[PDB]
Amino acid sequence: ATTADGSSILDRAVIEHNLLSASKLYNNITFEELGALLEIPAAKAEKIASQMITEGRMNGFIDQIDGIVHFETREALPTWDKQIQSLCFQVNNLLEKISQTAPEWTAQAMEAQMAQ
Amino acid sequence: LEGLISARVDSHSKILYARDVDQRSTTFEKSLLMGKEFQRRAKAMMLRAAVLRNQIHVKSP
């Protein structure tokens, strides 16, 4: 159907999908650069992004002073516990690879701590 | 002085501005001043109760 731009309904779902993926990948982009990547004017890239924050479907805030919209990617304390859990998760996946490739080395490394 | 607000009069531009201190500055300093008086009053009470043990009452007047 005729949904503003283009001649299909997918013209609106693509713009809304690119804004959600940019909230976790793009740091901070201007309103003039965000519209050029989607072939949309600057007046349309602001009204669509503002409706996603009110409904609770997209993170970040919009600054009307300089016209630079920022995206929230988690910081401060919530990022400290994420790096610790991601680091300990790599040791769990590495332990399953050592015992699978060479199960004899797993029992030998455990006895080295009890001998000291 | 009479009200309960906190405003600042800026005579350089005739605009009533506002300059407040941090929330951690007026809280940590107020609690530290009360903690010093708490330890001073508690230690001074032991000095008053010390003379009341060896049978030493008021003998000044």
Partner: protein
């Protein structure tokens, strides 16, 4: 704002609605002030029982 519906402050000299997202705390610091006032009056009562 007075009806506890819209947060922030109005600035007529700049035509900008202020909303400090990383402002100072007000939920935890409001309890330390009440604990200091209650402990100050309590110390004056326990010390008045010993002349």
């Amino acid at each position: 704002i007075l009806d506890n519906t819209i947060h922030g402050r109005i600035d007529q000299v700049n035509q900008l609605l202020e909303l400090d997202h990383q402002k100072r705390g007000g939920a935890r610091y409001t309890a330390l002030d009440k604990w200091t006032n209650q402990l100050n009056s309590l110390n004056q009562a326990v010390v008045s029982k010993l002349a």
